[PDB]
């Protein structure tokens, strides 16, 4: 059974991530695949390089990379954080079967921008500008299709349970 | 105080806004004043999503809302609900008409739940979505302050209700 993690930038989906790997699942984290390809061809900033995968590649291309990253290996939870559209997830899909399920972790706005802000690029104009720019890829839509949708606003112990219970619900 | 409600076509976002206009707030159903429209703009044919695009490519994506602003008897200080926008142009625009104090508010059912409800084909349903979406709802829903999300119990679906609606005021 694969979940397929999918978030606005200053979700705190991760803190879903630890949680599922900390239960031992394979967690891959999608941009550190593209993270690991930058570490082997130079668009300059990861953005751009990205931006020229999927056009030179596809739709489409990371969730391949993603599978690729997975081995033949067999796992009981395999889990790609930050999927971003739907054509990352036709692709998942089509290599892995059909145990494969959307989580959206939500968070609303001005939590997200409150939350980012204070990470130890700070302006509210530029956070704006970032959700843009994660619209135009389509997460907007993963998350439209999701198959569930974890919130937090509140509360890391809040955020906590609707995991555990997301997760068995599908587990 | 403005309530925007989204959802997806099976989400059940009318039982949301139902239950907010059994408790008193005037709702304005979007797809309702598009119709309005209809009689005096469209023709013939024109179903409906065919004429509702027109009108976005002749006034730009933010219309509906501007209609729904227009049919508000703008005077109207008190709260209203509008159930239910496909676009952030949408929501721009009920903000740029009604201020800062507005919320949008989306319903979410799972794909196979939001079908196996509007049967009770299935490629039609699935290309209704690709439309939905086409016109930006997600990121509609992506922006939501509260998504509330449907599965079993009316009654737990209304007790989340509650939950944000007060929240809400």
Redo the contacts between chains.
């Keep these: 059974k694969v979940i397929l993690i999918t978030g606005?930038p200053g979700s705190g989906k991760s803190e879903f991530a630890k949680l599922l790997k900390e239960r031992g699942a394979k967690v891959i984290v999608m941009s550190d695949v593209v993270r690991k390809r930058y570490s082997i061809e130079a668009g300059e900033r990861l953005m751009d390089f990205a931006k020229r995968l999927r056009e030179i590649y596809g739709d489409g291309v990371v969730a391949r990379l993603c599978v690729e990253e997975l081995g033949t290996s067999n796992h009981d939870l395999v889990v790609f954080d930050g999927v971003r559209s739907l054509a990352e997830v036709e692709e998942f899909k089509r290599l892995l079967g059909d145990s494969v399920y959307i989580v959206a972790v939500?968070s609303?706005?001005k939590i997200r921008y409150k939350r980012m802000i204070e990470r130890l690029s700070k302006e509210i104009s530029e956070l704006i500008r970032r959700?843009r720019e994660e619209?135009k890829l389509?997460?907007?839509?993963?998350?439209?299709?999701?198959?569930?949708?974890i919130?937090n606003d509140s509360n890391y112990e809040e955020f906590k349970r609707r995991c555990e219970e997301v997760t068995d619900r599908v587990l």
């Design positions: 606005m939500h609303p706005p959700d619209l389509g997460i907007g839509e993963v998350i439209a299709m999701a198959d569930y949708i919130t």
